[model samples]
Target: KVFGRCELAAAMKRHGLDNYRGYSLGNWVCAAKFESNFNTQATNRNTDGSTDYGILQINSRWWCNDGRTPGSRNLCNIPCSALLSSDITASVNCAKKIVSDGNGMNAWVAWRNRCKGTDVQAWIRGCRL
Candidate 1:
């Protein structure tokens, strides 16, 4: 199982994402936990016929190209498989670029559902990052 990012903030840190936009590491961690539980191998098809990928569960409808999805912008300029890996190098880069374009974590539905208005500090209580 790909471990949840909550107690593994240091891992994401090593991959070059930490404390973004005056936000703590907890923010992304909480989102990832609720999204795919940090499973890079995670994937799910939406009712809209779109699919979500990786720890961030990025949408094929907008982000990555699955080659079969019809309306994708393929904004990340890579295949959906690129996001599903133990090494999240491309996934992190793509998420960063996506955030640079807008409200960052707001793009994550899991964040909206769980982390929104929740305790940021409690999210990473014992990670000790």
Candidate 2:
């Protein structure tokens, strides 16, 4: 119920998320800022009928279980709700696979449209992590 950008960055760093998969912590933080605003329980139903889950907004159609949605690949092989936990382990682990899937953060529209190539210096400001 309580997670924000700084907290998200700390979690990422603690879990070795810095410079993950050739991407900077700034990029991840910026993407998280636009994607979920750091809310771990964030969820969004896309127009394509697939639902995005957790802080990373892992899509049900490709990443998580589709038992509640269907037509999914379930590449993450885990329940979408597992990403909603306060721990963020599932969310990060799932995201790791997604980034390494050849598209990098391009898989996330938010990362492509909002974070990539954008001025994201402020996203990491004041965070001592």
Candidate 3:
């Protein structure tokens, strides 16, 4: 597994997604599996040729275009390569920002509720991470 329970739990804590009552780690892992098969270095191209990269599949160009930082491009400059880089945490955190102010667990919950049962892949795509 890309993230053991403790690691995932730590990540969740960092993003204020420590709740496990209705949304458990199992659910999170399931989503991760379907999204990128636990490969922290996953990337894909949108129909428009835009790129999504990393375990959370963040768009590097968007990160730069948004004025997050110049080095952010290096973190997500390319597609698969960026996801494989050590700076993947930055990309994940950026996706977390899309959900809330650096909170991704909430976005996970929303994704589950919004896209669960209908289309799991859609749920993953909607996560923004």
Candidate 4:
């Protein structure tokens, strides 16, 4: 399911992403836009042979197990498929863990390349959250 902008904001806020680790909702919203275009089923295959899954593009190298990534830690202890559901609970939870335990918002290369140093307020502008 691809989410509309404000819909994504509301979902993130509902899942405790707002103000998480000093990153505001817009930061996450913006990251999602660039990372997966708010797509619950997005996947990116990396040149290094790892794959990123779901809305936040959680990677198989450390966060999930695709049974294909070499030496995958599966640190999130979930099948990579779990991240693709429209439910988004697993994706959001894993993203929170990635932020707190991995690289804050910097774990996403897209976030660093696209969202960082940009104005993100518009990502959440019309949202009630």
Best-fitting candidate, measured by lDDT? 4
Instruction: Report RMSD (Å) for each prediction in the order shown.
Output: 1.8, 1.3, 8.5, 1.0
Prediction 4 TM-score vs. true: 0.95
TM-score per candidate, chains pooled: 0.88, 0.92, 0.48, 0.95
Q: How many Å off is the CA of 11 in candidate 2?
A: 0.7
Per-residue lDDT for 14-98 in model 3, tens only? 5543333344434454555555655676766666455555555555555433243234443323344545553445545555455
Over all chains combined, what TM-score does candidate 1 have? 0.88
lDDT, residue 54, candidate 4: 96
Candidate with the larger TM-score of 2 and 4? 4
Candidate numbers sorted by TM-score from highest down: 4, 2, 1, 3
Alpha-carbon lDDT, every model: 0.80, 0.85, 0.48, 0.90
**Model 1 bad stretches (over 4 Å):** 4-7
Candidate 1 C-alpha lDDT tens digits along 37-124: 7788899999888899998888898889998788779998999998998777788888887777768678887787788788866766
Worst 10 residues of 1 by lDDT: 1-10
lDDT for residue 102 in candidate 1, whole number 0-100: 66
Tens-digit lDDT string for candidate 4 (35-121): 898899999999999999999999999999999998889989999999999888899888888889846888888889998898888
Candidates by lDDT, descending order: 4, 2, 1, 3
